[PDB]
Amino acid sequence: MIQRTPKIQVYSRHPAENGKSNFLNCYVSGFHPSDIEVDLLKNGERIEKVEHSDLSFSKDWSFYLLYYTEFTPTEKDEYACRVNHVTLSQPKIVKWDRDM
Amino acid sequence: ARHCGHCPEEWITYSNSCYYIGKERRTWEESLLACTSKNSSLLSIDNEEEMKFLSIISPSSWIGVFRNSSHHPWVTMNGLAFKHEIKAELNCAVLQVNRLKSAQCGSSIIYHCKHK
Amino acid sequence: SHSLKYFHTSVSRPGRGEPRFISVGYVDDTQFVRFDNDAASPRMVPRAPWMEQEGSEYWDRETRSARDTAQIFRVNLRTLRGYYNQSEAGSHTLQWMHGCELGPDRRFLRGYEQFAYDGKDYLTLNEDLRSWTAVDTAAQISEQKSNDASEAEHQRAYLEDTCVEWLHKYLEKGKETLLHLEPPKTHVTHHPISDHEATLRCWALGFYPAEITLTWQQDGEGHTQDTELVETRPAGDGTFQKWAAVVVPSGEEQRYTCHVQHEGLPEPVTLRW
Amino acid sequence: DCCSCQEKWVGYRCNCYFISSEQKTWNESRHLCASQKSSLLQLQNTDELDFMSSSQQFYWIGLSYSEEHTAWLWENGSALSQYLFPSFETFNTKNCIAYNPNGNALDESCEDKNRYICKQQLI
Amino acid sequence: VMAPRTLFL
């Protein structure tokens, strides 16, 4: 039974411009099986009412999802992506960087 | 094990006419002769509702409709002109999931027989 | 060139009986319909603004299809758990995908279709669309029970007929968006690592379709290396984003160039900083 | 007789079947079959819907769980062969069964909408 | 529109 490992990217929809309203994405992909847990984080806070794309998969049978929430960046607010999956010895957190 | 008297033994009857669900794959010509060996005609498509029935029993099947050259008129077995629509070097008509299509007269496909 | 791709996923759940079944339909790189037998609406819904003008006639038929496919899969999962002599306790995954590609000329170019069990290739539809070929020395069973039954046909017919005709039906319905090319908003940034090295990160934003390229070269010419390239990610507004960076000995920044290749571009762009 | 079989009904082995396309629940189909003066399909062997073995739909049959006998029973009281559906063991007793001409059975909610098959005997 | 018929593996 194949088990692949999520590939995580945390970013914003439009260039991050302090104060203005944007969007926070977390794009996990190339993982298998389908059961994955994803949370968006405001300073360690689980952001509630985060929605997510419809479960599709790519040419090699691996899955991909888009988690996302409307949000407004600041020079004091830190954001991140906590991802748990059956192939992770423990939840993997990738912090948001507006340069990547 | 009693069965209908008008129609052959393991045949099924639907609307005044008897049917034989092929389950064997054969070329249009082979089917034509087969159906004749079984003292009947190849599958003709009376109604566009007899077709919603047929499409529930079997997915695809040859039918009594063909063309000579890749362009003469589509003709029923009665030499008559066909009065339904239908989708290269293809010249025999098949029924595929409640639609009438053009196929290769040499292809092996399922065939059904039919009576009056 | 365009495409109508569908992706079907059925995951089994030992606990709550009925396995979950999800379907998504993509034209090109735009999703328009989805089905999820585990939502508020156990039917097919639109996921694109240009589908919200279809009637019961279509939304019904497609649900008929989805729901019926899902029952076939509930069976199949069992059927397979059998072949692979599997724990009835475990949870397993059946996947199916098919699609038709139109040539530049607007007419059918090629079609594909294949099944997968637990992330592994199970059954594939031959290029010539006339027969099925097993992959696992255990899908051989499903092979000859599909070649015999001759499903190859109604399938070969979907791809060439229905699928193609419908793709066109969709491209017309969603004309304004599906067809409009959106080139990338390219631009380079500078990112010092130490006193000695700096990162040149070439961006490409808000573009569609998702195929692109991004390449670094410099003084001298082609290639360089010590490069990073990230998976083309979705923005969420239907467009995409990708970036390619490279590390550079300080001061030399203006040796390097970034070559963006996209279909939305007249011809390849080049950036410097 | 043996050649009645209404119209839009199909006859086979001297019985009159009615494969529906219309989709209703179980108790609904049960009653519909009654009005037409026939029964919700009751299987002898898997070779009964032989003529339809190329089908991929699932049709409501007349199987249900008997609180009383702690057994799955046909609507006619007779018991379910241990063979017909080999997994009957794992059917949820709160569900009704839906059959597929191939030979495959699924236990779904007595509420879920499904296609049905009506049968008229003639002996 | 998704393929009408699937496959019984």
Please identify, among C180, C207, C234, the residue that sits at the C-terminal boundary of a domain: C180
What CATH number is given to the structural domain containing B25? 3.10.100.10
Beta carbons of C242 and C205 less than 8 angstroms apart: no
Spell out which residues of chain B touch residue D55, defining contact as CB-CB under 8 Å.
56-57
- CATH for C157: 3.30.500.10
Per CB-CB distance under 8 Å, the chain C contacts of D107 are: 17
My answer on whether C127 and C248 are in the same domain is: no
User: What angle (nearest 5°) sits at the alpha carbon of residue D77, between those of residues D74 and D82?
Assistant: 55
Residue B81 near chain E (CB below 8 Å): no
Residues C221 and C263 occupy one common structural domain: yes
- C4: tokens are 């109508």
Is the backbone peptide bond immediately before C249 cis, with ω within 30 degrees of 0? no
Q: Are residues C40 and C143 in the same domain?
A: yes
Torsion D106-D109-D113-D118 (CA) sign: positive
Check the annotation: does C56 bind a ligand. Answer: no
Cβ distance D52 to B52 less than 8 Å, yes or no, reads no
C5 has binding-site annotation: no
Is B95:B103 a contact under the CB 8 Å cutoff? no
Structure tokens at D1: 């007789």
Q: Identify the domain containing residue B99 by its residue range.
A: 1-116
**Burial class of D115 by CB neighbour count within 10 A (0 to 12, 13 to 18, 19+):** buried
**Alpha-carbon span C107 to B59, nearest angstrom:** 26
Residues C117 and C233 in one domain: no
Could you give the dihedral angle defined by the CA atoms of residues D37, D40, D44 and D50, in that order, rounded to the nearest 10 degrees? 100
Asked whether the beta carbons of residue E4 and residue C154 sit closer than 8 angstroms, the reply is yes
Put simply, whether C241 touches A (Cβ < 8 Å) is yes
Do residues C253 and C273 touch, judged by C-beta distance below 8 A?
Answer: yes
Experimental determination approach used? X-ray
Please identify, among C180, C213, C247, the residue that sits at the C-terminal boundary of a domain. Answer: C180
Partner-chain contact E3 C155, CB within 8 Å: yes
Q: What is the resolution of this structure in A?
A: 3.4
Q: Which residue has the tokens 């960087």?
A: A97
DSSP classification of residue D79: B
How many distinct structural domains can be found in chain C? 2
Among residues C157, C180, C203, the one where a domain terminates is C180
- The Cβ-side half-sphere exposure at C106, using a 13 Å CA radius, reads 7
The domain tally of chain B equals 1
- Please provide the DSSP assignment of C109-137 as one string: EEEEEEEEETTEEEEEE-TTSS-EEE-ST
Do residues C65 and C192 both lie within one domain?
A: no
Whether B48 has its CB under 8 Å from any CB of chain D: the answer is: no
- Domain residues for the domain of C41 are 1-180
Q: CA–CA separation, D68 vs C106, rounded Å?
A: 64
Question: Are residues C235 and C251 located together in one domain of the fold?
Answer: yes
Superfamily of domain A1-100: Immunoglobulins (2.60.40.10)
- Whether chains B and C touch (3+ CB pairs under 8 A) is answered by yes
Domains, chain D, in order of start with CATH, read 1-123 (3.10.100.10)
Length of chain A equals 100
Residue C33 and residue C79 share a domain: yes
3-state SS record for chain A: CCCECCECCEEECCCCCCCCCEEEEEEEEEEECCCEEEEEEECCEECCCCEECCCEECCCCCEEEEEEEEECCCCCCCEEEEEEECCCCCCEEEECCCCC
The CATH number given to whatever domain includes residue C213 is 2.60.40.10
Structure tokens at C249: 């000995």
Q: Spell out which residues of chain B touch residue C153, defining contact as CB-CB under 8 Å.
A: 59-60, 96, 109
Q: Which tokens go with D35?
A: 């009005």
Are residues C147 and C17 part of one domain? yes
D56 touches chain E (CB under 8 A): yes
Please say whether the dihedral angle defined by the alpha carbons of residues D6, D12, D18 and D19, taken in this order, is positive or negative. Answer: negative
Q: Is C265 exposed, middle or buried (0-12, 13-18, 19+ CB in 10 A)?
A: middle
Same domain, C202 and C246: yes
CB-based contact C162 E4, cutoff 8 Å: yes
Count CB pairs under 8 A between chains B and C: 17
Quick check: C145 and E8 CB within 8 A? yes
